[PDB]
Structures are given as C-alpha cells and as structure tokens.
Design a protein around this ligand. Sequence first.
Ligand SMILES: [Tb+3]
Lengths: 166, 169
Amino acid sequence: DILIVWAKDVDEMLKQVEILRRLGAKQIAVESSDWRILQEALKKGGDILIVNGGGMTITFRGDDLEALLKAAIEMIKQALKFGATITLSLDGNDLNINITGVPEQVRKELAKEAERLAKEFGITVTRTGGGDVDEMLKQVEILRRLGAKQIAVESDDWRILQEALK
Amino acid sequence: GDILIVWAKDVDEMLKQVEILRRLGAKQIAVESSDWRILQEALKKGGDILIVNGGGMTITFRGDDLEALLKAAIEMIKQALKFGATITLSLDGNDLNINITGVPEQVRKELAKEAERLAKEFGITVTRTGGGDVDEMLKQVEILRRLGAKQIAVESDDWRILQEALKKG
Ligand SMILES: [Tb+3]
C-alpha cells in the first residue's frame, strides 16, 4: 500500500512524513498544489510526488475571525449549491477553503464571489491551486530535473488539464 | 508516463473523466474517492489503482428543509473551527455529509454532542456513522482487493488516520 500525506504547509508536511517514517511506513507519497511543498517532500525522501492540479483553495485573511467566518459562510452556501466538496481549516488569521468536484465555469464564479465577499466584509482573499497547463508542464519538469522518479497528477476535472497530455 | 488520478464524487463524472484520459492514450489511470461505490465501479470498468480518502469522524444530517441543513452546516463549521478541526462538507440531496479530522478522540466526542444538539434545534436527524473508522476502511479495502484492486493508496490530511491505517495495514 501507499500512504498519501495531503500537505497544506511545508513544516506540517515534514512533521507528518517523519511521524510515519518513525512507525516504519515504506511508501510515503506527498500530495500538494504547492510546488515548494513538493520540492521539500522530494529532498526529505518522499517516495511519490502527487501534483494536485484540480479544485481551488480560497484563503480569507484578517484579524476579525468573525468577519472571516461570515465571508466563509457565503462561500460555503454557494459551493454546496454547485455540488462542491468543501474543506475548511482556521490556521491563525487564515481561514483556508479547499473546493473540489466542480467544473471550471463554477471555479471562476466562486473565485469572483470570494473577491466580492473580501471587499464587502473588508478582508483579504488569495486564490491558489488549479494553475495553468504551461505552469504545470514547467514545474513538473523542475521536479523531474531535481530527481523526482515518481510523479502522479490528480484532478477532479481533466477537460482543461488534458491539454498537458498533448 | 505518469499515473493520472481522477478524483470523483459522482460515478458518471468519474467514468467520463477516465474516458477523456483513455481517449488521449493515458496508460495508468487511478481513481480517488471517499465513495466505495465509485471505487468499485472504477474496477468494474477495468481500473486497478485506487485512492481511498474518506477517513475521520463521519456525520450525516437529513431533512426535507434544505435551508435548515445549510444552517446546521454553518453551525457545525463554527464549532469545528473553534476546536481547531478540519471539516469537509458535501450536500447530497436531503443529506448533508460531514467529515471531521485533525483532532484527538476527546475532541471528537465533544463535536458529536454539538451535532446531536444542532439536529434537535433545526428539526433534522443526525447519523453518527462509523464510515470514517479505519476498521470500516480496512473491511472496504479488502473488498476492493477481491474486486481486482492491484494498487491501493490511503490518503488523509490527518497523520492520526494514516498512522492507524499503517499499524493495521
Ligand atoms: Tb488526492
């Protein structure tokens, strides 16, 4: 079997991999949309790299944790209406919202609603993951040239990302 | 070539995605899902690499009032984030499906109580299900292997789930 560490933070990733290595895990894969986490996973001896090229992460930032929640609520209602799977975690002043299981048209709508909500509630929003096909080709080659022998690519929607196979 | 993973929560979308990749000449396609039906269907249609990702404390709210499920959803997110938990939600017809990870068993018990409380308040049912238990995962993994899964991976953001899966693997 393979154990896959879904990693959102480089230091969280390193701790999780070491915890599993300590207990004798022989096949550790690290999964991220963050190229930095994948490069650090590779240096620390991750057996498989999984490039997550699908979904979307919306991060609301602000010292008013109430205002982050109120924006996150409107995103959640919108995302659930579109049939999304939504994962939420509060990491300091960052409310992290991962959205999967929706097509590109819905990704674009939820990104614009996230930007609107940020201004309405007077907070900051950053969007990551589901980057362009050229960037994925470029960064996957960088992983290979760094010595990555085992790369998998993951998406909930291959209708655009199929361009990467041509 | 690289192994290409199709993440799926719908069986029909899963098959369409696998066909897109197969049409372009993808040699090794993996299917990833928390839904054991979708993983089983991936095997029936000739797949053999599967990723199981649904581990943790799984709770289902059920009701005819969509707006009451939505309200209970919001309140559970508030409560989860307060305890520093990671919360995954999906609205599947009249069922709001929730998975809680990143916390110890002591914190799991507290969020289960608040789930039963919010069920009563908003006039909906809660099913505290062992679907996310690693014992349930191992049983379902054995079924996948007997249905022809040659490569199984267990995925989580929670080191506690992967640790428990390693020890019993
Ligand atoms: Tb995955």
